[PDB]
């Protein structure tokens, strides 16, 4: 279930009860993204996480 | 100024992992508007 939505710079979306994602800015096709999440909730660049796990 | 907020950069097509089963993908960008894809648990 992939939820597709739209936000503008300065706007926010909630994921669950403890995580909020903020659209901080746009430069070209790059989006600055803010994340509020607890300590135990890890944040990863997905391509970096996949390279980590590809090495066993 | 933004407190403990973690700030990342994501280009169109790049994905962000939150926890073990949540992913956020930048699906498109124009102006100050971006489209986001959230995979739900």
């Amino acid at each position: 279930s992939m939820l597709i939505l739209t936000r503008r710079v300065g706007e926010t979306l909630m994921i669950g009860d403890e995580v909020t994602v903020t659209v901080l800015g746009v430069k070209g096709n790059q989006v600055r993204i803010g994340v509020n999440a607890p300590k135990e909730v890890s944040v990863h660049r997905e391509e970096i996480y996949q390279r980590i796990q590809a090495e066993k | 100024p933004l407190g403990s907020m973690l700030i990342l950069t994501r280009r169109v097509g790049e994905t962000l992992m939150i926890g073990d089963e949540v992913t956020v993908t930048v699906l498109g960008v124009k102006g100050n508007q971006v489209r986001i894809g959230v995979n739900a648990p």
Binding site: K27, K39, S42, V43, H44 | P1, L6, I7, L8, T9
Partner: protein
């Protein structure tokens, strides 16, 4: 006129969009990248410029943290990235990168400062995943604390 680093700095300021950035008594200036990242520039030598990405106040209580930062300098060395350093005057954690003035261009200066900013992003991510958030104080490098041993560190 200006040194070719001061002329480069004024030209980089106009290209990025910050009003008027100038070196101070200690040949240092500080400014904000996208109003998020504190970058300091040192006009130490006429052959190189120093880019400092002030990450945050060094954890006063964590002895394993310094050792983890040293151990991360291994992989920063592999990737040719900036150096994880400790500024003892402000007790700040820094990312330091040398910028050569020969063939220097505002495009290259911006791209090297972007390398520093990208490294700051990835470090902030790693620190968050370890449950660490660095305090945000003394982010503008007014002055570097000097040491007698600095001339041997070469």
């Amino acid at each position: 006129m200006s040194s070719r680093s001061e002329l480069l700095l004024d030209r980089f300021a106009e290209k990025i969009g910050v009003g008027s950035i100038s070196f101070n008594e200690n040949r240092l200036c500080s400014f904000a990248i996208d109003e998020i990242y504190y970058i300091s520039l040192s006009d130490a030598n006429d052959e190189y410029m120093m880019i400092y990405g002030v990450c945050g106040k060094f954890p006063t209580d964590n002895p394993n943290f310094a050792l983890e930062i040293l151990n991360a300098n291994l992989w920063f060395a592999e990737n040719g990235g900036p150096y994880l350093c400790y500024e003892s005057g402000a007790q700040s954690l820094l990312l330091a990168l040398r910028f050569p003035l020969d063939d220097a261009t505002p495009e290259k200066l911006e791209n090297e400062i972007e390398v520093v900013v990208k490294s700051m992003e990835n470090l902030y991510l790693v620190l968050h995943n370890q449950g660490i958030t660095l305090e945000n104080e003394h982010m503008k490098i007014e002055e570097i604390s000097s040491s007698d041993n600095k001339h041997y560190y070469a």
